Structure formats: structure tokens, C-alpha cells
Design a protein around this ligand. Sequence first.
Ligand SMILES: Nc1ncnc2c1ncn2[C@@H]1O[C@H](COP(=O)(O)OP(=O)(O)NP(=O)(O)O)[C@@H](O)[C@H]1O
Lengths: 407, 407
Amino acid sequence: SEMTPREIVSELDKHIIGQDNAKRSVAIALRNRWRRMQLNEELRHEVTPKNILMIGPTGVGKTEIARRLAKLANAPFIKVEATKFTEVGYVGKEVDSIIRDLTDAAVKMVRVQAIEKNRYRAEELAEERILDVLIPPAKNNWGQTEQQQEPSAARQAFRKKLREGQLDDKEIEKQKARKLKIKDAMKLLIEEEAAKLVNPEELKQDAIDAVEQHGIVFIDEIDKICKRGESSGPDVSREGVQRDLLPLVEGCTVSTKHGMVKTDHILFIASGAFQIAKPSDLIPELQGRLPIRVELQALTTSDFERILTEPNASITVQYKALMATEGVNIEFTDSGIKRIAEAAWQVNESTENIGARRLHTVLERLMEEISYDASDLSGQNITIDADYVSKHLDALVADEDLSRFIL
Amino acid sequence: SEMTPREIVSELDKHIIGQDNAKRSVAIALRNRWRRMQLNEELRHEVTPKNILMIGPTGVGKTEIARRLAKLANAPFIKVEATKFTEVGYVGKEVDSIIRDLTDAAVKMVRVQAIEKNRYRAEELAEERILDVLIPPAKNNWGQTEQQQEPSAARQAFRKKLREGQLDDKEIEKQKARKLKIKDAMKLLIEEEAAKLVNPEELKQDAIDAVEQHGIVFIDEIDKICKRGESSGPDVSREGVQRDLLPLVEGCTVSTKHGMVKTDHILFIASGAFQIAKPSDLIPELQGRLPIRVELQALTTSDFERILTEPNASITVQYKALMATEGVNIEFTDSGIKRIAEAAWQVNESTENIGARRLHTVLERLMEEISYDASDLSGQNITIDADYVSKHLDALVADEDLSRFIL
Ligand SMILES: Nc1ncnc2c1ncn2[C@@H]1O[C@H](COP(=O)(O)OP(=O)(O)NP(=O)(O)O)[C@@H](O)[C@H]1O
């Protein structure tokens, strides 16, 4: 029982922005996963996980979308740059890494949780182990097969004096540099028991599945690998990358550190805005394994204003907070934010679209002085208004052959 | 006994449209494999498997034909693009890798095929101890055999009570003695007391019997590695591969982490469309090692149509069930189907004739909304009629660009 296509989207809508379709498509993909494994043996393992090919500029969300999705969808993710496989050093054995990498990034995942579940027998057996101290009851147990509920009582009223009143430094009822104490034992006896419920197999075999079955790969700049003109050079080695991918894509088995895997039931997400080339130029074989094609729209002034603030920890936020530490306090007005955004955009349009990123520069650049002369004006309060903004930037933005340096 | 020529074919056109000849070829080969078993020892290990070279455009079948056959025959198979062996290929000098890989899967196969071939006990024997911890059998039993079917009074009750209701916190028996939950323990013991019957030795030695005997390879893109001349630069590099491959086809042995395998009798299937080169152009020794040459022709719309239906588990067929999963029946009209096919075809006749591959796209994009707006439809009913396809696709198929982007 997973989230409905729209249900998924909503979750994405939380920490993200536009790219709706994108969210939609990615969502769908997630959904199908369920439908897939919910039929008959024949197709059960005969339906190829539809792979998305994100077609948009500057990892403006796409990167995140994929990230977020796989996260909430709870599954092994992995960002891999296409080009990262072109040229000597690491080629064929490096293309297969993708999996390997992920697989590991998975085995680590399956661990950070395989312990969260057994996070009981740790502190419970960590306290009870050091609970067998102070004043013992008797030494007559296992004598009855139906009567055992009274003799053994060293903690039937001492378990509370080990919760808040643990302390101590006892031991029981060449290398040494650590002292054992119920105060630290209540916390250290955990590392011990937490290492008793860890079966490398129940983790290995667990991850391997939660990978070759729920894998999400994000191939960035896939468009790069495509082609150029007629006298292609490192491209005859580029296409190779593509080819070298097919296997994992088309579905296959690769040798890992914790065994072997199956890249068939895996989900991949190509990416990159195609300017020089197009999905069409892409290698048919692969171009065919990359179904769901989604067009990612640019970013609007509005969008910015949002990312400029909305985020749980906006860039404007932490900044005011940073200025705060300096005793100085700033005021990010809705009047200026618009201008802030109003700027970022202008630049992106004038120079070259990038989105989000543009901000860091435009903001930091506008907040120049303030950042510099802080204690030089500590205490008082400053207003970041639409006029204050333009007052600074205004010029720059206009001067194209320059903005390409400070922004 | 194995299927006669057409006997194979029949089971072959089960997922492939036309191109029978190739099937025949692929079929015959399969048959020969057995004929050899009849040809008395004298000519036993004195007979080549006779390998085939498939020659045809893109997305026309080849591949499938292979697998389908490989599957229909139950034998470790593996596709492989030569290309990943040329141009500064330090690994391209590892053409033997092939078997090393065909053996890897060869491993998986028999293995996984062993888990199912031995799972009737895998589960049973598991829950046993479970129930055994549930109703601890009495000590010292008086041999009567039927006296074990008696505890079933409560036992069976419990057993039946377990094949549904569980999640009880127990503890059972480098063995065990851990206190978890019957849920996990059921699958832990299901495995612990599962791998009891495997025999890694005879197992790993069972797999080789496949790769060595029942094994198939699909040397892909052979056409690439061929010729041109006038300054023999990358030429004496490509051809090389061919030679490097010979031994495998010819018949040699390769070192694998699993042992030694004899490519003597193995089905290698070279292929690719020689729009530029020609089989003749290919190195002779090989040209001669590829005795069976068959041609594949481009699929026509009619074929497409057929492809969207007749084939067992056709896209639509899948999509039908796939949609039905979200509790909603769809219906493609003989007219709509035509459209899809037509659509698909049209695109190929303006951008790139990627053949059959085209469909997957077309359709999937045709079912955009539906695939998304699913949960809500639940119980609803919709027919993908001509006027439907034509509504979504027509628009696209009309203009280029897009198609080259999302098709
Ligand atoms: N009879 C068929 N002819 C063509 N394609 C088919 C057929 N039946 C199913 N298909 C689908 O269409 C695809 C055709 O691609 P493939 O099987 O690689 O053919 P191919 O001729 O080997 N391709 P290529 O190497 O690109 O020329 C398959 O992956 C199937 O999903």
C-alpha cells in the first residue's frame, strides 16, 4: 500500500517547486513499481521498469526531485554523471561501478535501519546486563518448569535505579584505557548488544534485494554522451559510455562487493537539457530503454521569490541569522525579495539560465557591505527593501559583459 | 527430447512477429545441438555447433529471437557489443570476458533454479522449528511414527493458526537462540533451513555444464568491427577483436572464478545491419566460423499492430493488466491500435526508423494521463479508441522536434 500518483506528487510538492509534470512522471514511475509486483508470475517478472529521461536545464530541481522521490519512496539512490565515464582511467569497469557504487550506498542504507529496529535489545539488554548489580536475590533458578516468578528478583524493583540512577563504575556481580560504569555502560552496553543482532547476511541479502529490486539511478548530462557533427573524436568513446550503460539499463547482472545484482528491475532517470543534441541523437537501443520523456520548464521570478524564502532554511534566512550573530539585524522585506528574484532571473535570461544558483551570487553580492561592515554598525536594524536591492544590483544586471564575473 | 524445427518456431512466434527464416535458422541451430548427441562419439566432440550471423535493421527482432530461443531452450545467454573492445581498450583485449560473464549468469541460473526446485521443504522445514518452539514436543518419544501426527491436535491447530496469524515474539535454534518475532524468524529459518540443500560444489559444477553445453552468446554490432582502409589506423585494431573472438567461437577454454569452461559447443550469434560494411568485409576465419547467415527485414505497420496484440504479454496486454491493477479496465480499439502503430511508424518515417522500439514510447505517452489519473478512476471504464490516440499523438507526430525529443 504505497502512495497514489497524486499522493506521491503532494509529498514532492512539499520540498520543491514547479516541474509538476516531472514530479508527476517520476511519481507515476514509483506507482507502477507497485502495480508491477502485483500480477501473475508471467508478467510479474516480465514488465520492464519504465525509465524516465528528464529533459531540462541546470539540475534545477531534477536532481532534487529524483533525490527526494527515492528518499520518501525509501530506496537506494545514486547520482552519476554521464561524462564521468569518458576517457581513460576508469571506463568499462567504471560504467559497471554505477551499480556497485549504489549497491554499497545501499548496504549502508539497509544498515542504518537494520539497527533502528534492533534499537531495543540494545538499551534493554544494556541496562539488564548492568542491572545484575548491587544486591543479588538468591541462587536458585531453573529449578521449576512451571514456577518461576518470585525467586529471581534483583531488578524487580532496581530497574528504576538504573534508568536515571545508573551511575556506578562496577564490573560484575596488556591493553586498558576504558573504565566500565553503569552511567556509561547503559550507553556502552548498547554497542555490545547492538552488535549481536547484526547478521551480515540478513543485511547483505536484504540490501541486494532492496537494490536490484528498488534501484533508482540518476544519469546526469546523458545528453553529453550523444554526439556532435561529422568528425567525432572522443565521442566514438562517448557512445561507448552509452553502450556500456545498456547492460545495466537493458537489465543485466554485475559483480558487486556483496555478491551479484540484477540491473533489470532497476529504475534509471536520464537527465540534462538537450541543446547541442536531442534524445533522438541518443543511441536507439538506449533511446528505447528511456521511455517516459518529461520536459522540464525553466524557472520564473515567482519561483525564485519562493525558494528565496519558502524553504525550511531559505538562503535569506540563515543570512539574517548570520548577520544576527554579528549583533546586527537585517530585515528581508517582501518588497526586496521580489527584486532579489527580479534580479536572479534577469541575469539568467541575459547571461545564461541556471536558476537557484544565481541567487547565492546575487544575494551575497547585494549584501556585500552589510556582511563586511557588521560590527561597524552592530545593534541597529537595517531594511532590505526593493529600493535597497535595485540600488545596488541595478547597474550590474544591465552591464552584461561583467555580470558574467560577479554573478 | 527437444522440439522439432517448427516445434521451436511455433513456441517462438509466441513473442516474435514474422522473420521466421531467422527463427528457422535460430531454430535449426537449437536442433543441431541435440543431433550431435545422436552422432556417435566418433563425431561427437568432433562437430562444431555452427554459429549464426543475423543481418537486419534496427528493432526488428534479432535480440528477442535470441533470448526467446535462449529462454525457450533454458540456457545461460548473454548479449554483448563488440565496440566495448576497441579504441584504447585495455579491456578490449579481454574478449574472453564474454564466457567469464556467460558463466556468471550460468551461476545465477542453476542457483535460483535450485531455490524453487527445492522450496517445498524450504518453507515447511522452516516453520517446523517455529511451531516446535510454539508447542515444545515432549521429551523421549516412543517410536510409532503416527504419534507425531497426534500432537497435531493442538499442533496442526497451531500450524494452521500460523499460516496466517503470526507476529508472535519467540526464540528458536552458529545456530540461533535469539529472541525476535515469528514474522522475521519465519523468513530467517526459511533461509537458514533452506540453503541446507544446495551443494555449492555440485552446484557451481552444475552451472558450468550449462555454459559449457547449453550456453548462448550474442556478439552484437559485429558489423562495426570490420573495415575501410587507405591508412589502416584504427582498422588493425578493430579486426584484432575479431581474431581475439575467434578462439571462443573456434573452441577454447577460459579461466573463471568458477572454473574452466570450453566454448567448444556454444551458440554465438553475431549480428547487426551492414548498411556500410558487409559480412565478406569481416575477417575470413570468422566469416567461416559464421556458417549460418540469415537476413531480417523491416517490420511494417501491419507487423507493428500485430506486435501490440498477438504476442504473449504485448505492451497493451501488459498495460491492460497494468492499468487494471489500479482497478480500471481499458480497451484498445482495432482502429486505435492501428493508430498507435501508424503513429509509431509515422515518427520513424521522419526522424529515425528505430523500428519496434518506437511503439513502447508512442503508447506509453499515449497513456500519460490514464497511467496517472488511475486511482481515482478505480472501477471506471475507458476505451482507447481511434479518436483517443489521434487526440494525444496526432498533435506530436505532426511536428518533428518534439518527436525527436519525446518519442
Ligand atoms: N517480432 C518482433 N519484431 C521486432 N520487435 C519486436 C518483436 N516482438 C517484440 N518486439 C519488441 O521490439 C524490440 C525489438 O528490438 P530487438 O529485440 O533488439 O531487435 P533487434 O533487431 O535485435 N534490434 P537492433 O539491434 O536495434 O536492430 C524488442 O526489444 C521487443 O520489446
